Design a binder for this molecule. Structure first.
Ligand SMILES: O=C(NC(=O)c1cc(F)c(F)cc1Cl)Nc1ccc(C(=O)O)cc1OC(F)(F)F
Ligand SMILES: O=C(NC(=O)c1cc(F)c(F)cc1Cl)Nc1ccc(C(=O)O)cc1OC(F)(F)F
Ligand SMILES: *C(=O)c1c(COP(=O)(O)O)cnc(C)c1O
Ligand SMILES: *C(=O)c1c(COP(=O)(O)O)cnc(C)c1O
Ligand SMILES: CC(=O)N[C@@H]1O[C@H](CO)[C@@H](O)[C@H](O)[C@H]1O
Ligand SMILES: CC(=O)N[C@@H]1O[C@H](CO)[C@@H](O)[C@H](O)[C@H]1O
Lengths: 794, 794
């Protein structure tokens, strides 16, 4: 109750912050409230973990180099049923809760969809009350902070832990050695890894509260420490190198960069996690190891934690002294692999020299794994020499590299894609060789998003509305949102829905106006593309359509033009050149567009800085139009798309990733789908893509290109954007021009629907009403049932 | 009372440590109590700090690169008067109170005498209710942990913070920029210090509980961070370099090491501190700095923060735009300097080259000071061409250096030494050129220790006994120990006092044998020498006496030997070769002596690994004879000496430092004074030191030296102590041999007296009852009256 939360608050401000109202900072207040809310989950946290130890359910271990968590405070209140009481307590003390909430750093330990998938899943597994753990790296620096200076992305260290983090508790008793380098002896007592350099792994536990149940699971992130025995001053300074491992998240989205530190990160998180799991299994009730796969599941979050396979084997054979065949039966039965990667350059392949010098034993074990593997292939295909090098874990040509996917495929009992279409290509095409051998191993699990964070928290208006119509069951069972179909003809419900959208718009319009000094037309269409910047996602194409909108105003200023506020956001990897260019182009266009007095309030372009979990929560609920426009074949699933759908936006995009499943659910009539489908893409590769042909064929495209290339957007470097021009014309893998017309045409349909409130909101409601599939609660049921084989409990 | 303490402890264990009783670790329990205890000073801390904000009395800032704090928990309990009740609470919960206490890390952020002086000072300024603050660096790594391995010193990093520190509260709101490098620009707005690299300074507060009053003063310690703004991974890894500024404490006792990083440390703390003071001053109720010196004193703990002088000037002139002359009058009035050393090699003397690179503005301000300095020497000494070079701040040979001592002298209103003999020599000899001009500038302020850590804490037995006899008011006014004179008659007493000391040697003997392979004779005379390993402190001269003794059982195994445990402990600077060998020797000697079955239990020799504050709290109360044997004129004061006086041991030592003053106080017949006085060393230098004379001249010495050199103590390597011997005959500036004879004869009388229980304890009593002068409480009044001009309120 209120009075008690108020007494807790003051107690913390007093004792934990050593402050009285008189000189208390806003941060002092945030902290005091966090501690008050965190205190309210301790009992359930102990009891949950206690129950796991007493009843030994099969535990699920989600293993990942990335947990894109965002802020905890508000998410935690909501899931404890505490938000309203806290709101009121804080209000009564003359403070503003939204103000305190603003203080919190994001836990930006993620790049995008892969890392955010991890986050939604933990929330989901806690809500369904599974025995689940999150395991990854406690990066000192998460994804970097993005400033824009002269329309250019600028990186600033995400110093997220400067002031401390009250959502983590260290665990001094569970520190582990992790080993690197050294050499292998195959003595007559077992094979032994010796003369290694040691890093210590200190774990931190973070509470994963379930939505209104009694479960609080754990996320355990590891930290790098130097040992005490593995110039005096320099020696002590040198301890920096060991602790460097957990220092900074690699900021690459969908790109492999074969850096040594990264390899160290990957073993580091694998090694400590695997010990902790064995330790726990051994400390429990339960070749006592025969029960291990009845008590352990390890989901590989892409190939990043791939070493987990040769590591488990290493532990089983060398320490546990199990015979290799047994060790391998159990490895296969413990692991499952989730494939998210699509393009050649994202594929992790590690050079053999590197894997040999850093981890000799793992190399040996990997070769051994490979031998057993290629043996079986020879046996079923003796005249087939090419199938051998094709399915080998070693890409034997030149450099020589380990194909971590191949390793995950052979060490796991289940392999999965993240959307129907994708798993499909994965199974029938990309892995034809392996799936032929065991069709049943390969499955789909279409992606999902938590409707806690992504409806309840980021959008309480909608949540309340929906709840006032159909009650609150939908939160824990999003399929219940179909009940809304029975409100389609409800003229008054449509108004309340539009009102909700408009408040989100008004609020967010404040944000834009107070952060960018740019006049927002409150009633224009909020047309939003937020994701990481990559040529495949095609921010560029959107950008082109912006230019077309602008020109259309210029040629004919009196002509009926539906006002849009066009928002583009997301971070470019610091080494991704073309991505940085694509940013500079957008900010350039905005400068022209936002100041051309002849357009004024008809068109406003914002490039949205420092896009991240807590910003997604702001902008998404405020959106009318969700840009989702990758080249078909290039987007494994996507999740933003889903979050827009649930929050009352209409989606414009290609038949790619889960967009396809969105269209099935709500019916294509109710999305703005356009463009080449995968076939249309292949057929164009077959015949051959000539970018030129479209530039001559479409006069509006011709102008846009000409404007960009001749400095209309860059009079001080008329040829600033040349690199974009070349790529567009000669090296564009993603066929930007081939989809232009279809896109623009499709854009004009959105425009016309927008001029009919009733039709538009009717489509909105048919979307929201069908968004239920996309709850990460459904996804997890599916993983639980056909992969982990654990049951929900409560 | 106790019931609230049990609740609180449990609330912490539950809510702060997230543990129930059956899985709580020991660390868990420690923290739970620690937090409980901190809570109980919070009120007195806020009020003490409020109250200075209110009445606004003059503030004392003790600025030191070093704070040798030791452990906090028990000191805090005692001073807060809650040891009783806390003991109970822990007991009633079935927990070992002292096992808890042993979890706590020494805050080992000093080398020895200097950093412990500061730590005692804090306790006393708080006990006397001064508005005082300590400013230093939050070193990530304190003085190194010493391990003896094969009789050698090995160093381990002192990772005191890895499990966190319950006694500090970060103050993020008071974070600051410090500036480095760049270059000076002489524009017509004045001098701009430009293109500087910025390091962040983040303060952390530790409570300083006065003894049984209302005062809780603050110790602010600063940590280095990289700023905000900048190969991206590499750029991020490189933040390590800015943070290296506060990473490790330099481990030289009485020795100057001119490393760039150390200069950075020195600037860092001076810069953060001076800003923070200015901030506090402007924030109070006082562009008007006239009252600054009335509001603020800053004591320069030796020359380490000398840089504060030209920083304050720079702030005043460059930033506050005050006239040089005024800005200068204010500085001298603010600062005061405590000289702590006389060894030429311990004087800080910075290459201008380095200072010009790192602090180009500061170099100028120093020149500019020297100029103005040197000018007014010409006005009074127009023909003394030599006087100038003798008094300039700049030593001009080859690559010029900055004489930081001289700097501190010109820039402070008071310069003081740390004992009568020291200060006297500082005034009349070392800085005669200066003192002649302002005789009143130079003073003495004799060192002391706190009777809290060093009596009630470490030796509860002795304090209990004293309190029984004379009331418990001696704890706040030590001089009341004179009262214990009434008891010179009393044998009941004398036997009671002997009891206590025996009880300590027992406790201590149990710990001692459970460490080293050695059979301890618990009623032998405990001959303890502990302090940093130094040629000057002459642990060697002690080692020579130890051999001597052993050679007197080998010669005559059936003559009466007064039996003694000889304990020598201390850390050698990693870079200090002689001291490392000297340790090696003592351990060799140790291994020969403890394994001659003939010597048996007559003489055990123990080298005490890892001497530090909490270790000192154990061995001192268990001591009979205190070795204070530095060459006359080398120990500026000593503070070990005083601790052993307070704790019921008798002193064997030279007429050096405060020894002179302990003798003074107790009567010189009540200490074992011996060997060369100050003039004797003076004489011998002019006559010339000729070591071989005592080797020829003295048969008993001669054996000792031959054993060493021919390898009696290193058989498997008869060559080992080559350099010890060489040093001793052609290089020993500290004249071990010249006092060899006086010393041994002196020891012989100690031995003679130890066979007289009654006379011995009568001398021990005469020592304890006259130790009142040496309370740091007395030292502080004196600075308060005569340097800081502040008033002992509460
Ligand atoms: O009290 C606890 N605390 C925690 O486990 C805990 C500690 C943390 F530092 C943290 F950050 C998070 C958590 Cl959740 N656990 C517990 C209680 C009782 C028992 C029993 O078996 O009686 C066994 C127990 O350990 C386990 F984990 F098995 F439940
Ligand atoms: O609330 C406080 N807290 C502290 O001072 C403090 C904060 C810490 F984080 C810490 F680690 C230690 C302390 Cl001791 N102080 C205060 C109260 C009331 C007033 C008024 O003027 O009404 C002014 C005040 O500030 C000042 F500094 F003056 F004491
Ligand atoms: C949401 O999943 C999310 C992503 C992924 O969005 P896309 O599915 O790539 O469009 C990236 N960044 C943030 C902050 C998220 O919330
Ligand atoms: C005690 O003062 C102390 C010192 C300094 O003692 P000396 O005066 O040099 O003999 C050094 N180290 C520790 C741990 C002390 O408590
Ligand atoms: C390598 C990588 O981040 N892949 C991404 O994985 C997420 C989570 O499944 C998908 O939503 C997205 O379409 C896909 O691009
Ligand atoms: C520089 C340094 O460490 N000096 C030491 O200072 C302490 C405390 O002032 C004195 O006890 C000691 O005699 C002196 O040698």
């Amino acid at each position: 109750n209120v009075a008690e939360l108020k007494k807790s608050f003051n107690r913390h401000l007093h004792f934990t912050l050593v402050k009285d109202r008189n000189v208390a900072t806003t941060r002092d207040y945030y902290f005091a409230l966090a501690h008050t809310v965190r205190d309210h989950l301790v009992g359930r946290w102990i009891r949950t973990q206690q129950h796991y130890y007493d009843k030994c359910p099969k535990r699920v271990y989600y293993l990942s180099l990335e947990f894109y968590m965002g802020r905890t405070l508000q998410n935690t209140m909501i899931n404890l049923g505490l938000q309203n009481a806290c709101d009121e307590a804080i209000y009564q003390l003359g403070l503003d809760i939204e103000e305190l909430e603003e203080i919190e750093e994001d836990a930006g330990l993620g790049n995008g969809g892969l890392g955010r998938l991890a986050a939604c899943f933990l929330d989901s597994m806690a809500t369904l009350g599974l025995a689940a753990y999150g395991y990854g790296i406690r990066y000192e620096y998460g994804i970097f902070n993005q400033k824009i200076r002269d329309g250019w992305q600028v990186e600033e260290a995400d110093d997220w832990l400067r002031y401390g983090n009250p959502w983590e508790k260290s665990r001094p008793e569970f520190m582990l050695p992790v080993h690197f380098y050294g050499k292998v002896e195959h003595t007559n007592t077992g094979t032994k890894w010796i003369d290694t350099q040691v890093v210590l792994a200190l774990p931190y536990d973070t509470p994963v509260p379930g939505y209104m149940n009694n479960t609080v699971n754990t996320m355990r992130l590891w930290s790098a420490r130097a040992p005490n025995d593995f110039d005096y001053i320099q020696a002590v300074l040198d301890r920096n190198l060991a602790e460097n491992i957990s220092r900074v998240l690699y900021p690459n989205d969908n790109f492999f960069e074969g850096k040594e530190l990264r390899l160290k990160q990957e073993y580091f998180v694998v090694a400590a996690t695997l010990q902790d799991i064995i330790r726990r299994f051994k400390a429990s009730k339960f070749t006592v190891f025969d029960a291990f796969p009845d008590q352990v599941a390890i989901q590989l979050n892409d190939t990043h934690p791939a070493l987990a396979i040769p590591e488990l084997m290493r532990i089983f054979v060398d320490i546990e002294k199990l015979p290799w065949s047994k060790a391998w039966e159990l490895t296969q039965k413990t692991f499952a692999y989730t494939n998210h990667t699509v393009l050649p350059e994202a594929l992790e392949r590690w050079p053999v020299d590197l894997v040999e010098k850093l981890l000799p034993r793992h190399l040996e074990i990997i070769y051994e794994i490979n031998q057993k593997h290629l043996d079986r292939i020879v046996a079923l295909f003796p005249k087939d020499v090419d199938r051998l090098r094709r399915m080998s874990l070693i890409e034997e040509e030149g450099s020589k590299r380990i194909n971590m996917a191949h390793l995950c495929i052979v060490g796991s009992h289940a392999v999965n894609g993240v959307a129907k279409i994708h798993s499909d290509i994965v199974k029938t095409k990309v892995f034809k060789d392996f799936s032929e051998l065991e069709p049943d191993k390969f499955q789909n699990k279409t992606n999902g998003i938590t409707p806690r964070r992504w409806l309840l928290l980021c959008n309480p208006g909608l949540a309340e509305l929906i709840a006032e119509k159909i009650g609150e069951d939908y939160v824990k069972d999003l399929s219940q949102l179909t009940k809304l179909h029975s409100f389609l003809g409800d003229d008054v419900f449509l108004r309340e829905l539009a009102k909700v959208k408009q408040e989100n718009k008004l609020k967010f319009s404040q944000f834009l106006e107070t952060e960018y000094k740019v006049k927002i037309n409150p009633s224009s269409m909020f047309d939003v593309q937020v994701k990481r910047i990559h040529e495949y996602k095609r921010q560029l194409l959107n950008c082109l359509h912006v230019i077309t909108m602008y020109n259309r105003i210029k040629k004919d200023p009196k002509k009926l033009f539906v006002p849009r506020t066009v928002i583009i956001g997301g971070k470019a990897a610091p080494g991704y050149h073309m991505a940085k260019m694509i940013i500079k182009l957008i900010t350039s266009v905005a400068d022209v567009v936002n100041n051309d007095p002849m357009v004024g309030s008809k068109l406003k372009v914002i490039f949205l800085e420092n896009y991240r979990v807590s910003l997604a929560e702001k902008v998404i609920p405020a959106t009318d139009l969700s840009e989702q426009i990758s080249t078909a074949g290039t987007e494994a699933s996507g999740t933003g798309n889903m979050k827009f759908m649930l929050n009352g936006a209409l989606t414009i995009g290609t038949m790619d990733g889960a967009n396809v499943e969105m269209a099935e659910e709500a019916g294509e009539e109710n999305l703005f789908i356009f463009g080449m489908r995968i076939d249309d893409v292949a057929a164009l590769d077959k015949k051959g893509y000539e970018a030129k042909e479209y530039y001559e064929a479409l006069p509006e495209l011709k102008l846009v290109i000409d404007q960009i290339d001749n400095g209309f957007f860059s009079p001080k470097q008329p040829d600033l954007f040349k690199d974009i021009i070349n790529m567009l014309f000669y090296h564009d893998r993603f066929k930007v021009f081939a989809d232009y017309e279809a896109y623009v045409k499709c854009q004009d349909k959105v425009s016309q629907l927008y001029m009919n409130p009733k039709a538009w909101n009717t489509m909105v409601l048919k979307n929201i009403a069908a968004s239920g599939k996309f709850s990460s609660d459904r996804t997890i049921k599916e993983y639980a049932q056909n992969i982990w084989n654990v049951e929900p409990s409560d």
